[PDB]
Design a protein around this ligand. Sequence first.
Ligand SMILES: *C(=O)N1C[C@H](NOS(=O)(=O)O)C(C)=C[C@H]1C(N)=O
Ligand SMILES: CC1=C[C@@H](C(N)=O)N2C[C@@H]1N(OS(=O)(=O)O)C2=O
Length: 244
Amino acid sequence: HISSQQHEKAIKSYFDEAQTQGVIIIKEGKNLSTYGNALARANKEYVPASTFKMLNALIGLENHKATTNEIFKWDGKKRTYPMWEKDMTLGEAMALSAVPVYQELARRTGLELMQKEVKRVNFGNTNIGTQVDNFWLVGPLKITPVQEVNFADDLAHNRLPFKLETQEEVKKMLLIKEVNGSKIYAKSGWGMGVTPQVGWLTGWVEQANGKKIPFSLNLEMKEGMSGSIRNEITYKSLENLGII
Ligand SMILES: *C(=O)N1C[C@H](NOS(=O)(=O)O)C(C)=C[C@H]1C(N)=O
Ligand SMILES: CC1=C[C@@H](C(N)=O)N2C[C@@H]1N(OS(=O)(=O)O)C2=O
């Protein structure tokens, strides 16, 4: 009974109230629906930032650069965040979004193999340049929100060019929330090394019946903004549309 006009107004209001500019793209089957307060962001390129952890993990696991139980030791050097000053698996580093572990994984893969794999999966603009440890954080690698929701759709359905086991292993690392009978799998991103700063939340909802609904939220992260606003806008948008 709720009008399209009302759903669009409600979702736009979530971005407006957060005093930011953003989009949330939802995919139902092959149909992409764009919502939010800055719809033109849908086909614009931004650094993937920490959302690249999903592809970094797939590449690393497929090419035997790590195992899912392997403990990446903390080197003992000071980190930006105290929770990163510990030993962790790829899964733990995914949940904590610990950059040093994923920079170690990128270094193990190496520039030549990383570029070949990024080109093979056809991720975003597919350019990683000459620095294997920061290309997803400060460029040249860029991707659009439409490309991110299509990547999430491919991963959710095991359509990426990796072993089924590799995709299942990475998907297990991405469970962030359980609402009723729905499971939310996603990875956030915050491009802190670029101006303006981009904020992402890309993933999918696995409904009780087995249906997978991919999504990609993309917005501008502003001064003193909490990371949780990406999760709050996403959950409110998915709940408004009856996805959760
Ligand atoms: C990812 O974009 N990162 C790593 C880390 N986690 O942020 S996230 O939860 O939004 O992924 C962070 C604090 C910032 C950011 C970065 N550019 O290093
Ligand atoms: C809020 C945090 C979330 C998380 C992330 N998603 O990047 N990071 C950074 C900070 N945090 O915990 S801290 O060590 O207590 O700051 C940590 O593990």
